[PDB]
Design a protein around this ligand. Structure first.
Ligand SMILES: CCCCCCCCCCCCCCCCCC(=O)OC[C@H](COP(=O)([O-])OCC(O)COP(=O)([O-])OC[C@@H](COC(=O)CCCCCCCCCCCCCCCCC)OC(=O)CCCCCCCCCCCCCCCCC)OC(=O)CCCCCCCCCCCCCCCCC
Ligand SMILES: COC1=C(OC)C(=O)C(C/C=C(\C)CC/C=C(\C)CC/C=C(\C)CC/C=C(\C)CC/C=C(\C)CC/C=C(\C)CC/C=C(\C)CCC=C(C)C)=C(C)C1=O
Ligand SMILES: CCCCCCCCCCCCCCCCCC(=O)OC[C@H](COP(=O)(O)OCCN)OC(=O)CCCCCCCCCCCCCCCCC
Lengths: 148, 59
């Protein structure tokens, strides 16, 4: 609750962004927050399959209604709860908060860096970050540069 | 073969004190156990619920 309050609201773009490290982020973020109503579609499909089986083999309707409920019950039991999804949601929300803070810093100083950015794009043809390039440069200096 | 049928006794017997006295005890015990099990299931169910989400939120 505390982390979600700080974030406020989550948009699908950020979820798809974090999909890189957790492909099941949507499947986990649905089981933590009351976003949308979840129907046990897999359970209902298995129930319909059992219904077709019973219809073929002429079972009483009580049996097929019970065999429709049962897979649905299993799906619901395996869906709800699942507090591990809450841990994964916490991790995603931490990532999202850091990303949003950095994005706000980007927007705040965008005008200040316009000129430097224009100068930089014309000299470096790489899109890699400045931090990574500078760490690589520091390692290159530490290795090849003569101590003298 | 036409299957035979019967008239369930409890549908046509005048209510008696013995039925009441015994089924009262049986229902007392049934209620106790059902209440305990249902309380356990209720705690489990409510704790299984998700956390409240924002307004008009996807994922
Ligand atoms: C025929 C049709 C009938 C239709 C009925 C429809 C009913 C719809 C119900 C909807 C849900 C209601 C939930 C109420 C929750 C109450 C607790 C609460 O507020 O918790 C907050 C709850 C968090 O819960 P929690 O704190 O974690 O734990 C709650 C626990 O209950 C633990 O909390 P606690 O520790 O405070 O517990 C208090 C303590 C209290 O216990 C006691 O001390 C017992 C005291 C009993 C006193 C009774 C006195 C009666 C007097 C009798 C006198 C007779 C005299 C006769 C005289 C004769 C002449 C001599 O324990 C209990 O309350 C016992 C509960 C266990 C029940 C056991 C039995 C279960 C099986 C039987 C069920 C009934 C079957 C009826 C069949 C009828 C057939 C005809 O969160 C909320 O804020 C939720 C609020 C509630 C809304 C939830 C909505 C969920 C929606 C889900 C989607 C599907 C909905 C479908 C709806 C369908 C409608 C048709
Ligand atoms: C013990 O041995 C025995 C047997 O076993 C071998 C038997 O089989 C039998 C015979 C067995 C049978 C006939 C079994 C077949 C018949 C059956 C099961 C029919 C009975 C069915 C049931 C008991 C289940 C249905 C009943 C319920 C779910 C109960 C529900 C009760 C509810 C909702 C409570 C209603 C009351 C209220 C809400 C109270 C309202 C008033 C107030 C709150 C007061 C106001 C309060 C304030 C604060 C202002 C006997 C007699 C026996 O003795
Ligand atoms: C006395 C003998 C019998 C005793 C039985 C005892 C059973 C014990 C069971 C133990 C396991 C308990 C598991 C509990 C899972 C509960 C899931 C559930 O429905 O939760 C409610 C959920 C919404 O909850 P949530 O997203 O958290 O939102 C509120 C947050 N504040 O709701 C939803 O998201 C709604 C969608 C999911 C539920 C779908 C249900 C489909 C049911 C299909 C029935 C088909 C058969 C119909 C038969 C009649 C036909 C005429």
């Amino acid at each position: 609750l505390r982390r979600k309050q700080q974030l406020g609201k989550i948009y699908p773009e950020e979820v798809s962004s974090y999909t890189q490290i957790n492909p099941d982020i949507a499947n986990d973020l649905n089981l933590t927050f009351n976003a949308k109503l979840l129907w046990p579609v897999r359970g209902m499909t298995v129930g319909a399959g059992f219904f077709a089986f019973a219809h073929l083999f002429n079972l009483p309707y009580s049996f097929r209604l019970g065999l429709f409920v049962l897979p649905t019950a299993v799906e619901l039991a395996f869906t709800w709860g699942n507090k591990t999804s809450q841990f994964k949601s916490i991790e995603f929300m931490d990532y999202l908060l850091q990303y949003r803070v950095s994005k706000a810093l980007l927007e705040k100083n965008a005008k200040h860096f316009a000129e430097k950015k224009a100068a930089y794009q014309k000299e470096i043809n790489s899109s890699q970050s400045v931090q990574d390039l500078y760490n690589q440069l520091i390692t290159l200096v530490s290795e090849q540069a003569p101590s003298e | 073969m036409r299957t035979k049928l019967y008239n369930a006794a409890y549908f046509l017997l005048n209510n008696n004190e013995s039925f009441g006295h015994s089924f009262g005890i049986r229902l007392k015990i049934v209620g106790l156990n059902t209440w305990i099990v249902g309380y356990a299931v209720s705690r489990y169910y409510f704790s299984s619920l998700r956390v409240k989400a924002a307004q008009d939120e996807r994922f």
